[PDB]
Structure 1
Amino acid sequence: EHVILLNAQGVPTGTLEKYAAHTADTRLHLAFSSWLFNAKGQLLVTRRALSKKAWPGVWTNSVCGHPQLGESNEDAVIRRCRYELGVEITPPESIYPDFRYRATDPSGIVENEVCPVFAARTTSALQINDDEVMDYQWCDLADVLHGIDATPWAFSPWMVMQATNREARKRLSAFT
């Protein structure tokens, strides 16, 4: 797997091996973030495995990843949903298309991404990949937002930034 490096205008300029790509000096690359809900409308919150190179052991939104060259954002979501959580989903819908951020994790590992955000509903049960996910919780979105508003540091920085975007949050309130 690779990440796709981006320039100022946001044009792909090349690739890097994914693990190799996330360092103390991570360069701008393409990513996605996804928020998964079940048929009943609960939000799936996950806890990244301890072996993750960036933000290991951190609570965060359902699934995030790195689109590969020539891959649509929607397919990346579907691929990573299957891969990390072994779950099938409805066609991902856009909730925050211009999200972009840079952040540093407690060990100094940086994420620097153009990171469009999507939402979808699961259509099958989870089958956890414990290389990616060490724990998860099916929750009411309202409580998760309250938790995010009260103690944002208990969650991944990008999850917090997405959920506090006025529009994203409105859009998330529709899967409930």
Structure 2
Amino acid sequence: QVQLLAEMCILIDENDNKIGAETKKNCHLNENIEKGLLHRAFSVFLFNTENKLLLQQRSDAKITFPGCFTNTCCSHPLSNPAELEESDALGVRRAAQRRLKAELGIPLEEVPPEEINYLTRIHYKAQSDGIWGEHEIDYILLVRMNVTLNPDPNEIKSYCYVSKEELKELLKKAASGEIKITPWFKIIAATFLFKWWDNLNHLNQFVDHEKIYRM
């Protein structure tokens, strides 16, 4: 069940400069996060062609945030030449295509890197339990397209396309404890998500490849 070699994450400084690599496990231990260990990540927000946002629910088997709802795909570029590539954020866009297939079963041809749009970067920290957490500079990637979903149940328990109002209702259910959402998704929904969603045809104003936002 466990792979022979551990997956590697890209270690970065607070300015998103590559400074090394560490195992996925080590990158997500609270004890290391508290020493400042920070890694590169991405977060895909995919909208269908009626502007419904695609949410995933993480499988109960995931190490961090099992069973939690979040946006379309939250994962990491690998520490290899393909995904280390920083020109036009190609590395993270390639990573996103890779994980859209692995997690949601979306064929590669449906989401080529060229159609994955890099908006901005957000630096955040979160805790999952007593052992595990998150600490990332997260590339925000936006997609609007109809895709064919066949998730790997080992990765994804369910998915849901939500309108703005449906999301608002879902967040109410999370607040009452009826369902679980990741700390990332909670904070992004509270800060930027609806601003982007109200402006899907005018996103250029939100493109910022210089400033790294903090939340």
TM-score range, shorter chain: 0.7 to 0.9
The reply to whether residue 74 of structure 1 matches residue 93 of structure 2 is yes
Match for residue 45 of structure 1 among 33, 50, 55:
55
How big is the alpha-carbon RMSD for the aligned residues of Structure 1 and Structure 2? 2.3
> SS of the residue aligned with 2:43?
strand
Counterpart residue type for residue 49 of structure 2: A
Select the structure of larger CA radius of gyration.
2
Residue 107 of structure 1: how far off its partner (Å): 4.3
Identity %: 26
Match for residue 147 of structure 2 among 102, 124, 127:
124
Paired with 2:49 and 2:170, the residues of 1 have a C-alpha distance of 23
> SS of the residue aligned with 1:124?
coil
Match for residue 54 of structure 1 among 64, 80, 85:
64
After superposition, give the CA deviation of every residue in 1:71-119 in whole Å (9 maximum; x if it has no partner). Answer: 4221121111111001133612234x12110011134411000012111
> SS of the residue aligned with 2:30?
coil
After superposition, give the CA deviation of every residue in 1:47-89 in whole Å (9 maximum; x if it has no partner). Answer: 1111111111111111111012324221121111111001133
Counterpart of 2:198? Answer: 173
> SS of the residue aligned with 2:111?
coil
Counterpart of 2:183? Answer: 157
Residue 149 of structure 1: how far off its partner (Å): 6.6
The reply to whether residue 7 of structure 1 matches residue 17 of structure 2 is no
| Structure 1 unpaired stretches of 5+ | none
> SS of the residue aligned with 1:101?
strand
Paired with 1:134 and 1:142, the residues of 2 have a C-alpha distance of 23
Change (3 A) 1:54 1:110: same
| TM-score, normalised with respect to structure 1 | 0.86
